[PDB]
Ligand binder design. Structure first.
Ligand SMILES: [Cl-]
Ligand SMILES: [Cl-]
Ligand SMILES: [Cl-]
Ligand SMILES: [Cl-]
Ligand SMILES: [Cl-]
Ligand SMILES: [Rb+]
Ligand SMILES: [Rb+]
Ligand SMILES: [Rb+]
Ligand SMILES: [Rb+]
Ligand SMILES: [Rb+]
Length: 164
């Protein structure tokens, strides 16, 4: 298990534009296209992302291309974010994956807002952090995915993903 396998479990793979858990147009492995309700706006974003005439459909290789961009950019953005960088650097490589997962799902700014949980993580107060992380819209709206991510933070193991 690694970050790619983890997010592939959590996000799935779809080759046609679809609506994510929040109702937003998405494709591939959790590649958010737009929050607009206009499918045409989503289709324009897609063509621009891939560099061709897709009208809503991509290949697996293309989906994987966007996914590695998105993971790379999540890591890079964490390391440029003054709130998230110290926490990332303080964490072991398994727990880092949980942080990348959260940023992938809810964006940098959203994760950086978990001030109290981030402090508990940097303090290595794992069960306290886990309790705090669950007190969130995040957890309420996607509780099974959040449980998996939280278990990864709490334990530093892949127990919540091994054989998914
Ligand atoms: Cl439209
Ligand atoms: Cl993009
Ligand atoms: Cl604790
Ligand atoms: Cl709490
Ligand atoms: Cl869920
Ligand atoms: Rb998804
Ligand atoms: Rb996403
Ligand atoms: Rb729509
Ligand atoms: Rb580290
Ligand atoms: Rb905050």
């Amino acid at each position: 298990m690694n970050i790619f396998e983890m997010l592939r479990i959590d996000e799935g793979l779809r080759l046609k534009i679809y609506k994510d858990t929040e109702g937003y147009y998405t494709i591939g492995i959790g590649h958010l296209l737009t929050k607009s309700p206009s499918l045409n706006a989503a289709k324009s974003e897609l063509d621009k992302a891939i560099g061709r005439n897709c009208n809503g459909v991509i290949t697996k290789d293309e989906a994987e291309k966007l996914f590695n961009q998105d993971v790379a950019a999540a890591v890079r953005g964490i390391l440029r974010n003054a709130k998230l960088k110290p926490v990332y650097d303080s964490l072991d490589a398994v727990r880092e994956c949980a942080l990348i997962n959260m940023v992938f799902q809810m964006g940098e700014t959203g994760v950086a807002g978990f001030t109290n949980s981030l402090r508990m993580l940097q303090q290595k107060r794992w069960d306290e952090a886990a309790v705090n992380l669950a007190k969130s819209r995040w957890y309420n709206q996607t509780p099974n995915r959040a449980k998996r991510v939280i278990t990864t933070f709490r334990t530093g193991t892949w127990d919540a993903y091994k054989n998914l």
